Amino acid sequence: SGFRKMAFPSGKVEGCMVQVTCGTTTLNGLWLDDVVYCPRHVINYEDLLIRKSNHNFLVQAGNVQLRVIGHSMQNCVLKLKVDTANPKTPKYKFVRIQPGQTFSVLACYNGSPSGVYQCAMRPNFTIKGSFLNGSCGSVGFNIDYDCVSFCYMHHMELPTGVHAGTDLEGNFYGPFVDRQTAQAAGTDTTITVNVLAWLYAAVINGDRWFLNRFTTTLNDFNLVAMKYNYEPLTQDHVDILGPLSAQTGIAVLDMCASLKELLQNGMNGRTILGSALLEDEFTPFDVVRQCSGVTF
Amino acid sequence: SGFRKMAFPSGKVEGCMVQVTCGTTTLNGLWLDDVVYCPRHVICTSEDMLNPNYEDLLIRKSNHNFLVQAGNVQLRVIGHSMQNCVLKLKVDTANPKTPKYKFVRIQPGQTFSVLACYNGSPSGVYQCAMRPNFTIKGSFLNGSCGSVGFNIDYDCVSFCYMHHMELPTGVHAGTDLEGNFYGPFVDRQTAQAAGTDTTITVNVLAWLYAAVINGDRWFLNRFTTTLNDFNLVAMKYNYEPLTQDHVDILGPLSAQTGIAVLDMCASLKELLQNGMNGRTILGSALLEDEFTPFDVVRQC
Ligand SMILES: C[C@H]1COc2ccc(Cl)cc2[C@@H]1C(=O)Nc1cncc2ccccc12
DSSP: OOOOOOBOOOHHHHTTEEEEEETTEEEEEEEETTEEEEEGGGOOHHHHHHHOOGGGEEEEETTEEEOEEEEEEETTEEEEEESSOOTTOOEEEEOOOOTTOEEEEEEEETTEEEEEEEEEOOTTSOBOOOOOTTOTTOEEEEEETTEEEEEEEEEEEOTTSOEEEEOTTSOBSSSOOSSSSOOOOOOOOBOHHHHHHHHHHHHHTTOOTTOOSOOOOHHHHHHHHHHTTBOOOOHHHHHHTHHHHHHHSOOHHHHHHHHHHHHHHOOTTOOBTTBSSOOOSOOHHHHHHHTTTOOO | OOOOOOBOOOHHHHTTEEEEEETTEEEEEEEETTEEEEEGGGGOOGGGSSSOOHHHHHHTOOGGGEEEEETTEEEOEEEEEEETTEEEEEESSOOTTOOEEEEOOOOTTOEEEEEEEETTEEEEEEEEEBOTTSOBOOOOOTTOTTOEEEEEETTEEEEEEEEEEEOTTSOEEEEOTTSOBSSSOOSSSSOOOOOOOOBOHHHHHHHHHHHHHTTOOTTOOSOOOOHHHHHHHHGGGTBOOOOHHHHHHTHHHHHHHTOOHHHHHHHHHHHHHHOOTTOOBTTBSSOOOSOOHHHHHHHO
16 A cells, blocks of 8 residues: 655666766766767857867766767757766667656766656646756656666756756757746646546545546546646547556546546545645556556 | 655665565565565464564574575575564675665654565655654555665665555554664554654654745744744644754754744744645645655755
């Protein structure tokens, strides 16, 4: 029993964190094979990069300085070719995630991991992370079997305290750019499929007070979802929630009628899984993983 | 900016997780140097869980009865001893991945990271607090016994908890790494219950200071309180008494924000009386008590 916000074990990623220094700027790099990936703002990025030589980039892996033998830019990520392949490189892939998907973030400062937390890519493409100066280059990841899927690299903090970054190919999530200019996160919405998954996790943990005899149509639910700034629930989401629906005996549209009642009436002083708010940072897969015990 | 429940990076602990099998029971072990630490109930059978005589069960065991697996490598047990509720299996290989470590026993209110494991394989990492009733509100399924709680301050891993059992309310009880249980619990299947839980007051105050540091001031008020008047109100909401030690501990956060500790105590009293009124503090509609004053300073 128990339901916690749980991150993947960060060990495979800790062995990849390096410190990248260029001039006065120091941030984090991800050392995979013989390449160090980091935000290109560490340095007109084409004009700024052409002026830099390999020895201008100081890369530090622990107390060992790596020598940069090449540099190239891919979108908003700088790729520093180093002489040494990382012996700790795990099986990995670069994956771009969709809003609503969750991942673990290994927050780093000076190439040293300080914390790990689990979060979701908001529908407005920001992450509600926890980052201070020097955290740039910190990465988001998931693990499947022994394979690390890198999905995020931290680049900046928006004026509202939320965070923006890119995939490992340097493409930003959201309508953001990597420079000092007026940028704002769009109005956020609740990840509906994730709330439903969390309501199933609550039922699995013995919290049933919110269940009701009612069921709704997908179209009637989406009219309610639009009114409460909840993301539309698609037939794909309903299908994805299928296993949880089978395990608990609560059909997705039966759970939607519970969600609709919770949105129109509130919690009435009650909590679900120790929360007075509807949690939306657990995907249906996270719920199955945690309420079954999948290891890495 | 931002405030998240943050766990320590688990890599230093992942390299220590092993699987310990004794008969039909399989759980997790912590391999440090040439010793594997695990819950002593790994030696228990079906009719042993109610009233086990661990000394009597252990004397009947031989080294080759304990199968220890580190990855796809079987470790050879060359000795065994019991220290309180932890079994210590001497193995023939020192763990090359042993980090700098220490065993620390924590007090209620203290936080730590848990590396949840099944079959010696880490599956997740989360942040916890030792409740005032000595239980932890973890996320554990069968096979998670032997999973450990830790803090990583300055490259040294401080092991503070080892999971042993789940109480009937879904909460968890365990020991320090010297095998001493936290709380009045015993490693027996006899009727045991967690005492009524209370809110860790010093942690809520630290979290209210984190909220002020992150720019949220809506809950602040023009009042102050005496420490005694705060405790008389707070105990009525099942909040732990706030001691002068706690007030002293909150001193640095009081200095950074400019809000006297007893002034923050008056905001807490008002929040307890009024609730949040549809508002949130650091993305929460409840008062968070699993961030210590040390965690708040570390993260902010
Ligand atoms: C044999 C069980 C029950 O009785 C005792 C009694 C005493 C001891 Cl020290 C261990 C156990 C074992 C136990 O609590 N294990 C577990 C620990 N964590 C999460 C669990 C989730 C679900 C099922 C069991 C869990």
